[PDB]
């Protein structure tokens, strides 16, 4: 089997992706942010606090006649920006883009912060990194991926977001239309939960490539990308006027500037994001300082490919018994 879904942008920044999934039966569409830094599938539903939902489409298992509540199960969650959320959980039939799992974990939301409360257009999480990683207790919940893996036609599923524009999810096959050149495979380390890879180094603009290992997660649900504050300070010290503001929370420029690409290695390949995907505009509505799509990780703890080097390329994550990341230009 296979499956293709379009996967949408938020708003004009790029800041999210939204995939639809349908959800029980008949089905329920939901919109979801699938995120391969996290393994939970989770969704604001009928159980969700009242007063925590501000205009998402909710589950509601009631009405699915294949819903069955998965008993003492519970899930909570906390990801890399501080939001959270938790709740119980039940198996349902879940589609996307055509492919069909029975029996997936759907994780019900009976609490979220704030930040997904004020976010109207996504309505949960479906989580694309390894199994381990999934919060459900006392029996660890398999990902969507994970359970379609043995049905489909090869065992991948395939990025290819846009820059301000709908991109592609594809399960079970490499679409060998939607890239340039050839895709560049690349190891993967699965100790942490995450696809988890060595950059070969990097390069600011039309400068020399500097060969320097960079160890970090492709991760499509974090939307920018956070590599060391060497790389970041050289990449910053190219834009006149732009500094990193402790109080704005990172690296911003004059909005009047043009931004050099910056370049990463994969393997001998290079993919090059363009100066444009690295601008997210201003930092509050009217300023004329805006905020920078290439930041420190040094708070971190991990540097992070998210959508910004992502959507520059067309991304195989590639969960054969030994797992591998593949990226061609696009």
């Not at 119980?88 to 589609?95: A, C, E, I, K, M």
């Not at 950059?199 to 600011?204: D, E, L, W």
């Not at 929370?249 to 290695?265: D, E, I, K, Q, R």
């Amino acid at each position: 089997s296979t499956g293709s879904a379009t996967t949408t942008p938020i708003d004009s920044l790029d800041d999210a992706y939204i995939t639809p999934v349908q959800i029980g039966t008949p089905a329920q569409t939901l919109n979801l942010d699938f995120d391969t830094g996290s393994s939970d599938l989770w969704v604001f539903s009928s159980e969700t606090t009242a007063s925590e939902v501000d205009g998402q489409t909710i589950y509601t298992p009631s009405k699915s006649t294949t819903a069955k509540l998965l008993s003492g199960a519970t899930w909570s969650i906390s990801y890399g920006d501080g939001s959270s959320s938790s709740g119980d959980v039940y198996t349902d039939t879940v589609s996307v883009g055509g492919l069909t799992v029975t029996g997936q974990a759907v994780e019900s939301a009976k609490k979220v912060s704030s930040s997904f409360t004020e976010d109207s257009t996504i309505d949960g999480l479906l989580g694309l990194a390894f199994s381990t990683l999934n919060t459900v207790s006392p029996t660890q919940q398999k990902t969507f991926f994970d359970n379609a893996k043995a049905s489909l036609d090869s065992p991948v599923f395939t990025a290819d977001l846009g820059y301000h524009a709908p991109g592609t999810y594809n399960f079970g096959f490499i679409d060998t239309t939607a890239y340039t050149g050839s895709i560049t495979y690349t190891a993967v380390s699965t100790k942490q939960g995450f696809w988890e890879w060595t950059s070969t180094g990097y390069a600011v603009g039309s400068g020399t490539f500097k060969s320097t290992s960079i160890d970090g997660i492709a991760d499509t649900g974090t939307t920018l990308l956070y590599l060391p504050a060497t790389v970041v300070s050289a990449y910053w010290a190219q834009v006149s006027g732009a500094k990193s503001s402790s109080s704005v929370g990172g690296y911003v420029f004059p909005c009047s500037a043009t931004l050099p690409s910056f370049t990463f290695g994969v393997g001998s390949a290079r993919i090059v994001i363009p100066g444009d995907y690295i601008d997210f505009g201003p930092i509050s509505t009217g300023s004329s300082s805006c905020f920078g799509g290439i930041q420190s990780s040094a708070g971190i703890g991990i540097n992070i490919f998210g959508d910004v080097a992502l959507k520059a390329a067309f991304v195989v994550f590639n969960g054969a018994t030994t797992p591998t990341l593949g990226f061609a230009s696009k």
